[PDB]
């Protein structure tokens, strides 16, 4: 038994040295020659009213016009962001939703939470009403995140320390991803959907191969729970938002942290993170009621989105990069530009 | 300025807003209760009288109760406890025979109660404390002294003094006695006690809102 522990520690030291060997320079040094982004002053173009409780999740539709939001009042609202019209209002069987997803085709939405179930809703029903397509059961902990791969595949992270891939046709877990020692809080699909990255309460982030079911890489450095994770648009990097009040950028190929986004005045946790279309801007939501725009290449606080009276629980950039939506515990979503 | 279909879509949005407001009004007048306790604390009895979260709906004297049994969640409590920040009250359970049991069980219940009562999300949330299985305590106290659990205890090993000492031990964990109240109950009587506690909480909250309490 002790020999296995010794070999594990030896491998830990070996990989630590291997990462260190490749740390010949720092991203901040390499980017010292680029001009800083001007002050990023965005304004609330629209306010989406209608939720009567804390908003916990939101997701843009691929058309960059429709977005779904989940709130503790037990509703999914699909909004027309251009007009603020409510396209749909889906009453949830369990009001304890904590995540929501919009299918890339726009035909389905997903949501889940303390019920430990991912429910898929059909938006294009012949009868003209949204109905529960399928309820995915099998997770033993709360559903913290979910993301469609197709109309027939969805990947979900759970508080039971595992991520699962589902076949929505049969309602079965095609693959189960294990290795996190803490609750998996966030999930992000790569642009090609060949890989996805998850951050857990064990303060580490893991890269998964969707088809092989393997853990490709593990990333450490955060001092606390990773609440948010997002893939860089390139698909070779991702940013993590943690309770330790910092965002960190990890590179898959360099297999180590590149840059950390922190400030002395920032001492609260980070609830959500997202990139702009080019990836130059890293937008993060904070418990201190406002979102901070970060220069992803420079580490500088490039802007602030201060428009919410409570914790900014979720945010998302449109697929065309035209707007940012921030949900909040104050029960409002604001579109910024 | 709007087209015919745009005006129809705006009308649909207005109808959705109407339905949302009606649902909010209906939900705003419902008492939300969070039920907590140890793995064998007897909360099964509480639910009986009245794979994740279990919701129990019941109505008593015109009050509608949403009671949330979250004990099935083996995940990290820190990550979802804020979901219940708005509950009117918390029902906490602790089997009284736990004093001389091992996972010590009484001490685990005190640790959980300390971590819940003094939680930053429940500063002003009142707690209904149920001390269950008093009949078992009456029999077991005659054999196992309460001092086996609380060395500093020195009262006579009888139901009254021992149970009062346990209640004092749990109520002493309240570090914010000025802003928060604990309604203890040894145990249709329990549902009546919950009704009384929640109605007192609601009355006091209303008086605080109107500047009388």
């Amino acid at each position, epitope marked *: 038994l002790d020999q296995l522990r010794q070999e594990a520690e030896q491998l830990k030291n070996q990989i630590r040295d291997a990462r260190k060997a490749c740390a010949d320079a720092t991203l901040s040094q390499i980017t010292n020659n680029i001009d800083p982004v001007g002050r990023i002053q965005m304004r609330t173009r629209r306010t989406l009213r209608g939720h009567l409780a804390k908003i916990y999740a939101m997701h843009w539709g691929t058309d960059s016009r429709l977005l779904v939001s989940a709130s503790q009042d037990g509703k999914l609202i699909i909004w027309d962001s251009y007009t603020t019209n409510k396209v749909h209002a889906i009453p949830l069987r369990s009001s304890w939703v904590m995540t929501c997803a919009y299918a890339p085709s*726009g035909n389905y939405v997903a949501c889940g939470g303390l019920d430990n179930i991912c429910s898929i809703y059909n938006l294009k029903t012949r009868e*003209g009403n949204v109905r529960v397509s399928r309820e995915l059961a099998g997770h033993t902990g709360y559903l913290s995140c979910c993301r469609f791969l197709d109309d027939n595949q969805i990947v979900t992270s759970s508080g039971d320390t595992t991520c699962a891939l589902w076949d929505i046709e049969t309602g079965q877990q095609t693959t189960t991803f294990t290795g996190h020692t803490g609750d998996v809080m966030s999930l992000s699909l790569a642009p090609d959907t060949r890989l996805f990255v998850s951050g857990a309460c064990d303060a580490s982030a893991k890269l998964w191969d969707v088809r092989e079911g393997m853990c490709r890489q593990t990333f450490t450095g955060h001092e606390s729970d990773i609440n948010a994770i997002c893939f860089f648009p390139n698909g070779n990097a991702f940013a993590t938002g943690s309770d330790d009040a910092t965002c960190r950028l990890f590179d898959l190929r360099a297999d180590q942290e590149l840059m950390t986004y922190s400030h002395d005045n920032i001492i609260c946790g980070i609830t959500s993170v997202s990139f702009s279309k080019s990836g130059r801007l890293l937008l993060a939501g904070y418990d201190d009621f406002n979102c901070n725009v970060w220069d992803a290449l420079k580490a500088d606080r490039a802007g602030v989105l201060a428009g919410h009276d409570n914790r900014v629980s979720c945010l998302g950039v449109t697929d065309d990069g035209m707007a940012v939506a921030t949900g909040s515990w104050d029960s409002f979503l604001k579109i910024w530009n | 300025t709007l087209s015919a*279909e745009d005006k*129809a*879509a705006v*009308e649909r949005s207005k109808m959705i807003d109407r339905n949302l407001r009606e649902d909010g009004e209906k939900a705003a007048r419902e008492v939300k209760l969070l039920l907590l306790g140890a793995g064998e604390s007897g909360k099964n009895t509480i639910v009986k009288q009245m794979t994740g979260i279990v919701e129990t709906h019941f109505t008593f004297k015109d009050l509608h109760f949403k009671m949330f049994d979250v004990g099935a969640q083996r995940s990290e409590r820190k990550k979802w406890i804020h979901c219940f920040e708005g509950v009117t009250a918390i029902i906490f359970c602790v089997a009284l025979s736990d004093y001389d049991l091992v996972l010590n069980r009484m001490h685990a219940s005190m640790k959980l109660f300390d971590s819940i009562c003094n939680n930053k999300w429940f500063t002003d949330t009142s707690i209904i404390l149920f001390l269950n299985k008093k009949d078992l305590f009456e029999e077991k106290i005659k054999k196992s002294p309460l001092t086996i659990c609380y060395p500093e205890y020195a009262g006579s090993n009888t139901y009254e003094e021992a149970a009062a000492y346990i209640q004092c031990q749990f109520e002493d964990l309240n570090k914010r006695k000025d802003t928060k109240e604990i309604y203890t109950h040894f145990t249709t009587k329990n549902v009546q006690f919950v009704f009384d506690a929640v109605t007192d909480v609601i009355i006091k909250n209303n008086l605080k809102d109107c500047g009388l309490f």
Partner: single-chain antibody
Amino acid sequence: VQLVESGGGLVQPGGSRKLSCSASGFAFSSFGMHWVRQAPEKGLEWVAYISSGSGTIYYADTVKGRFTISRDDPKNTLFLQMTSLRSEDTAMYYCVRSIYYYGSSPFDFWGQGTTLTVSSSDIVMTQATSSVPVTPGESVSISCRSSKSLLHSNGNTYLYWFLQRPGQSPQLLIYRMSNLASGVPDRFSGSGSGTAFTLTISRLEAEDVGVYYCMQHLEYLTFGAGTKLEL
């Protein structure tokens, strides 16, 4: 999804009768309902509209003040109360469901229709090509024009295409001038610009035989005279 109209028959001129439509298999309450009539040997004509929730109601100027449209949502039924029946009111009346939200397809389902016999500013849509010989496997186009531009400032071109197969209710083919309706083959395609639109049936086959009607939905609804395609 089913709509069954009833209450037709023979009525004396100047009389009154009520049409009723029974809805089943869909959320009747969330749909706006239309009444569309077709004279025995002519095209479609919009009659009345009642919104979802009954907030908005419209009538054709030719019938305004005479007919009344009402719905019983708990009963899932639509009504048309007709008074002072004229000779021009002789027609088969269709009940059509319409749901309006971003990306929806209005006019997507039509009832089987009920025949009524009476004893005896608007946008103009033109289908000057009234008939076209057809052969299977060929590619055909059906042109249309409107007096006003149907392109709204919000980017939508409010033109609809309906195919009335011989002896059937009209079926939606394209809505908003480009979107293909569900259950329609990919052969059909809509296009248009400058207040002129065309419907292309490439490599046409059977079941594409009948009268094709264009309809505008920019403002209150007008149909074209209908282009007949025959083998």
